[PDB]
């Protein structure tokens, strides 16, 4: 983390063991690419030098698989950034090494000069995680997901909602998918119960109506 | 959280990682809408700016399903509040944005001006969670719940008590349901044992009598 | 908790999140009424105002069932205390509200005037938990417990020891039950092995002899 | 714990909740008598007054069974110490009560006078745990342990190594048992694979050779 | 840990209980020799005297098996170091005891004189863990690993990637193994799906292509 000395001096202290425990526990239970890890890190990564955002990501337990896809995607995003900002004709500017904080000494990362670099680094990592989770089809194809046999509608809803959120499409498309799919991919037992309960509004029904009917009596 | 400087100045510090771990552990084991989460948050949300009450809720792991119902219910409650307090003719008053702390800068949230806003925000979230848990019928219909085959009476009692508590009805109704249902929805093995043990007081028996008889020899 | 300012002033700080995690983890793994929770709370409840002893108890995860029995038993004990100390003819004395710290403001609880109240409150809660665990027959009837088929003698010993401890009887009775039952309620496989190993001292054998024989070769 | 004030004054602070969590987690996962608990406590018991070493032991979750054997063994060791040091003819000396810190007030325990008592108390507890684990045959008889069917050689090695360590015999005996038993108590599938892989050195083979052969291709 | 007093004095404080919890949790879930433990320790072992690096390793829960192989390998590496640096003809130099910090008092370890010793000790332990994990074939032979029946390609990828990383061979060899094996050791269901999806690039395909095809629709 970056420490703001009273005189405005900036120094680096190791990520507090407690912060690793929270990030790691989210990483074991939910995916390293899971939106929950993406959020936790974004809440706690306002005070983290560029190197730490990268190190915490490497240290967090998770499959070598996802850590492999993220490393490739993170590099790919960095490539695009570099073609975008040719080296600076006047002034230091930002090079991929500076933004990824490779070649710079830990204390230097805290120095305010890199203020921009922490932000961009977090941006790529939080872009990388989003891209990896979508590719991992951990949510899966949105229409593809269907109710498990003898499964609570809420659980199907949880998978269906995650898939609808993961797809990179405008909100209106997500809304139509959320209302229409909830019934189409639903199991017959909830489907029939919803069909009678919500009548002919099954397509125009909200998630709340469908989840206060199949899950409940 | 809000920090009261000795000079009475108010500053914001991130929720301590430890506080997220306790809230998250309750959220994984018990529901994000579970009464236990509702209590923990209410014990630790006296010092939390309006934004944090909302952020901690979003970050806590839980189904996207419940996080979907809560977001809708929280908005619905905010709507009712706004129809109730038309904009202020004289003075700032409270707008939905101020109470939900959207559009305000983090440090500003701590400023005492928003004292009222933290309270209302916590009120809606703690109302929202209550409403979502009741809708989720996670306790289920109160009379509907019945003893599982080969299940300890205490476990049936735990489901029966939760359902009786969740229903939004006056305490006397809850008392009648607690005494009468405990025997009616009970399995025959406890039912017969209680019938002989408590004699003709099975309807007028307390939970203690029924739980010191079927669970015990 | 109660904070002793250097000038002897007493102020209240929220129970540290860490202390709730330890108490909660004991409560999920072992019973809220389990002796382990009874001990942890008694080690950490010397500095807790009366309100906190009551709040921590409500917040700790546990069945609504036990939380129901404890609430009734705690009230029952408070009743007995009140019939015992009729209101004070001269002086404030202690009323049920003061001891349960209901109607008093948080900061007031820390004030030394209530020193007696924290002690009594902890006394009732720690009496209540003991009574609830015994009623819950979570240890069960002491003679009733018997060795599970294909179960280590140590495990049977653990249930047998807990039941022998829970029964509210003089130590000599507990000693006789511990020595005699260990063999009588034991499974035939340990029983026969102990019968040959300890010879005719099976009744006068200690737990150590029986547990260094059936568990071991 | 004992706090060394700058003026050399000694005061007692409660064991930090975090220290109980680490000791408790080791106690649930590994035995209260497990060598791992024996080590953790010995690393953190240099600053603990005699009373705390005893209290932490009582509070740690574990079977009432082991807590029963340890209490007896701890008393037995204290007995031997007392027959060894008849009361002091001149000077306070150490009595069983002082070493076990029973009858002394908490703050008094921290006072340097008891410096010797903390050491002896920890000595008996760490002797007691060692004795209880050996008696519990949790490692079991060393030769008796054999490879489980369809079990990794490393797992058999882990049980075999623990049993070889638990037996109170000179290191050379442990070395012979470690080299010879590793093959004799091994399952035929590893046995045959090792017999071909290590040739006629199966008796003179180290653990490394045997574990780089059966576990690996 | 080593504490840098403002005057540059160096003092030792016990490893904070929190740091043991993070290292232990990684050790229970992942191997004590697992790369994740190797990393965590390397992030937190810049401020640890030589003795602590060794003690934390002994205290961390893990099989007595791996703790046996590591102890042997650590000694073996120390041997090589000693044949390499014959005792110092002029000056203290480093002896195996100084680097392993055996015979030196705790406070002395923090003294800057041993600065070199902490680094070397960490070097051997982090070399030892790497060697033990490779020997443990916990990743296993790289070509040997194959897709489990009805297993997600990502899981096979995770085992395949770990094995490819563990083998001590130049990166180009790892790249060829990663691209070629991913298809060869893959199960027929992913194999056939990949064969059609990636066409004739199955050998020249990256991990990303193969994991966006078999795992996803």
Describe the structure.
5 copies of one chain form a homopentamer. Chain A is built from 11 helices and 2 strands, in the order ββααααααααααα. Chain A is mostly helical and 217 residues long. Chain A folds into 2 domains: 134 residues, Human Immunodeficiency Virus Type 1 Capsid Protein (Orthogonal Bundle); 59 residues. A two-stranded antiparallel sheet of chain A has the order 1-2. In chain A, a hairpin with a 5-residue loop joins β1 and β2. In chain A, α2 packs antiparallel against α7, α4 packs across α7 and α8 packs antiparallel against α9. Chains in contact: A-B, A-E, B-C, C-D, D-E. At the A-B interface, α1, α2, α8 and α11 of A face α1, α3 and α4 of B.
Key traits:
two-stranded antiparallel sheet; Human Immunodeficiency Virus Type 1 Capsid Protein; 3% strand; homopentamer; 217 residues; 2 domains; mainly alpha
Number of helices of chain A: 11
Largest interface: A-B, 29 and 25 residues
Q: Regarding CATH, which class of the largest domain in chain A?
A: Mainly Alpha
CATH topology of the largest domain in chain A: Human Immunodeficiency Virus Type 1 Capsid Protein
What name goes with the CATH superfamily of the largest domain in chain A?
A: Human Immunodeficiency Virus Type 1 Capsid Protein
Relative helix content of chain A:
55-70%
Beta fraction of the residues of chain A? under 5%
Assembly level: homopentamer
Mind summarizing the main beta sheet of chain A? 2 strands, antiparallel
Rg of chain A over CA atoms, rounded to whole Å, is 22 Å
Counting structural domains of chain A, the number is: 2
Label the overall shape of chain A: elongated
Major sheet strand order of chain A:
1-2
- The N- and C-terminal alpha carbons of chain A lie at a distance of 51 Å
SSE series of chain A: EEHHHHHHHHHHH
